[PDB]
Amino acid sequence: MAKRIQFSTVGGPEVLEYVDFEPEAPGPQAVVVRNKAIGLNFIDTYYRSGLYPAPFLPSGLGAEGAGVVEAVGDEVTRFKVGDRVAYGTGPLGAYSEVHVLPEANLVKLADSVSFEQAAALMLKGLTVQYLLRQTYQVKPGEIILFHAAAGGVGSLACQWAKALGAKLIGTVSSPEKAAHAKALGAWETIDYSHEDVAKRVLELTDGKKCPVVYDGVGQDTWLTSLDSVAPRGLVVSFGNASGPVSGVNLGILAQKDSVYVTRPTLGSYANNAQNLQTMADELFDMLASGKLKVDGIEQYALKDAAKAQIELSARRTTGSTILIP
Amino acid sequence: MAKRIQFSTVGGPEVLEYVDFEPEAPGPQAVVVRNKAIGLNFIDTYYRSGLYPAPFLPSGLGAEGAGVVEAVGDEVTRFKVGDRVAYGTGPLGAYSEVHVLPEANLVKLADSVSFEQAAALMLKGLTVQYLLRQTYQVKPGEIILFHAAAGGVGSLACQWAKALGAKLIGTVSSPEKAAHAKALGAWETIDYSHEDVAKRVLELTDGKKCPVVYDGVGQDTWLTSLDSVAPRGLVVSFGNASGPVSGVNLGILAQKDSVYVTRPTLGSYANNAQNLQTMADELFDMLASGKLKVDGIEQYALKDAAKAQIELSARRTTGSTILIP
Ligand SMILES: NC(=O)C1=CN([C@@H]2O[C@H](COP(=O)(O)OP(=O)(O)OC[C@H]3O[C@@H](n4cnc5c(N)ncnc54)[C@H](OP(=O)(O)O)[C@@H]3O)[C@@H](O)[C@H]2O)C=CC1
Numbered sequence A, B: 001m002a003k004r005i006q007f008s009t010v011g012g013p014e015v016l017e018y019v020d021f022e023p024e025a026p027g028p029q030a031v032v033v034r035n036k037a038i039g040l041n042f043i044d045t046y047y048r049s050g051l052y053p054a055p056f057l058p059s060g061l062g063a064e065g066a067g068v069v070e071a072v073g074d075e076v077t078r079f080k081v082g083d084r085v086a087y088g089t090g091p092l093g094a095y096s097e098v099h100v101l102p103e104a105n106l107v108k109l110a111d112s113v114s115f116e117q118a119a120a121l122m123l124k125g126l127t128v129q130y131l132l133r134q135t136y137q138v139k140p141g142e143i144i145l146f147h148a149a150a151g152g153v154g155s156l157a158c159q160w161a162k163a164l165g166a167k168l169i170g171t172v173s174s175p176e177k178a179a180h181a182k183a184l185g186a187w188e189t190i191d192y193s194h195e196d197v198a199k200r201v202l203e204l205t206d207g208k209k210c211p212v213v214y215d216g217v218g219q220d221t222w223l224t225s226l227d228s229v230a231p232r233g234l235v236v237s238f239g240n241a242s243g244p245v246s247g248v249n250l251g252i253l254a255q256k257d258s259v260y261v262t263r264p265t266l267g268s269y270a271n272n273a274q275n276l277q278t279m280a281d282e283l284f285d286m287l288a289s290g291k292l293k294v295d296g297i298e299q300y301a302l303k304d305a306a307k308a309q310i311e312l313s314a315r316r317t318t319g320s321t322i323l324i325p
């Protein structure tokens, strides 16, 4: 028996229950991980709310974590008991003392990386990697727009953008979050709790606007992003914090001067035990070289996962926050 | 006084009237063209139907044509009376004996190109140019999907794709249109009057699907295009023959494996008297080199523009068709 956070029905935070459950016996290519640190991600709230249906109820939650390998399937050779690993993709269940998942979703941690750093970087870091390196290969000097610049993904994006020589214009909801973003490497900040983002962008870019706009909040900033992208530019809708963007008429893309739009998912970029490896190597290489940093991690006891999600959804957090089993 | 085709109200073909009107005096940078050949384009039916509002009623129609310069604005130096020109962008009014437009929308014709070739190539040719060279730089060997392969744009696309060494899979509504497309350079054809396009595409591409899908029919093929694009591939929605594609939830882009979508417009790519020049030079260079050809042009008297539009909308045409003033 082991403890985990699960829900028997979709809904608000009250739906989460900290209870005993019986971990499954690893498949031939599965790995049993004894979690030491668990990630907190906005998508966790969507599975719990039902925005994204689970395969069955009661359901586990979470897809990011780091810990020690406890058991290995008979066909697994990459990992052995005792190995220190991390993951940011795979089946639900990270919110547990013991998580079982395909070896394809795991990446061995270098002795130099702690479990807290991994649980705070993995998923969000892999996302920034594909957003800035694959979805749209940001080049030095480019002026890009990135919403929620002080959030989990946003904070890493500020740092990565700076590392690339790009000039990231990060939108935030308060002068406090603005200072946070700026300190992490944001070129310019815009407080969209009252400022006109599109206007500010037009002036900051000398009327040329941004070749690419990264939007993880969705609904509330869709028009803003459409008005901030340069002609034939790209609007990357990778999040739905404020809600999903729907009911769009492709005709608006033409109206905004023939722009492009994509709705990427980590699963599509890290769709191999291996495209994951290459991506993870770059992420951890950034950390090891000192271009990315975490130090400054809020910690909640796995049993208090509900409290942690409430703060996240309430927009009362900055950077990464982890759960300790 | 001169004759033109105009409409005092939006609606069906019956709305078109062949009447006398008084051409305006060219502005300082405007050019008066004595049309010898006028293009027929699907968008013409949309302005007439009201899908795209005119600035005022009664309104002229058409944006493609070729003829002799009759008058020049005082500030115009690129053109002089007698010059043989062509245009595929600009204000409404091509459906006339005399059309007045900014010099920025004109391109001098080489003595070797007749007015019929220009009126049949200009707009559609410039579109294929930006679709295959700018929207998505098709490379030799790539397998691409292109709907309505026997249409005006489609027919040129079959030829251009072949010239590029690409393998175009063209969808058509009949074995007759299929033969037409094939003869023009289409690699493979699919009769979507009954065949499963997505299925055929999956088998023709060995399960890899198409890096890019060009869709000028819209509504009726949106899902088909989404199911025919490769992961992280691009779906180019440049037309609405079957109707516009609306009410889409960006979430479907993720569902189809993180794809991209754009809704380009000729105006956005040929947005300069000059980006037009470079594009036109390539188009006419293809014609001059024998890679693109027209010969096989249906002709309607400008006064019978309604009959011409009825056939176009009825899907009873192949290649280009022009109106003679
Ligand atoms: N596509 C993919 O592969 C992935 C997508 N994501 C998505 O990326 C985004 C960022 O996730 P993560 O780093 O975990 O989260 P964050 O830590 O960034 O938290 C969300 C932040 O978004 C902003 N926000 C704007 N409007 C709202 C709103 N109405 N309610 C709540 N928050 C709002 C807030 O910042 P402020 O107060 O400054 O506005 C808030 O702090 C999410 O939308 C997430 O679902 C995450 C991982 C992968």
Ligand SMILES: NC(=O)C1=CN([C@@H]2O[C@H](COP(=O)(O)OP(=O)(O)OC[C@H]3O[C@@H](n4cnc5c(N)ncnc54)[C@H](OP(=O)(O)O)[C@@H]3O)[C@@H](O)[C@H]2O)C=CC1
Pocket (backbone or CB within 6 Å): B040, B041, B042, B043, B123, B124, B127, B148, B149, B150, B151, B152, B153, B154, B171, B172, B173, B174, B177, B216, B217, B220, B238, B239, B240, B241, B242, B243, B264, B265, B266, B267, B312, B313, B314, B315, B316, B317, B319
């Ligand atoms: N974005 C841009 O810059 C431009 C866009 N366009 C658009 O490109 C497309 C092609 O235009 P053009 O070459 O003039 O036209 P076409 O000559 O290709 O005529 C339209 C063709 O589309 C297909 N089609 C499919 N469904 C329908 C339907 N329900 N009703 C009528 N036709 C249908 C038909 O071929 P089949 O019978 O084989 O299915 C038909 O022949 C149009 O949608 C047009 O508006 C044109 C120029 C520029």
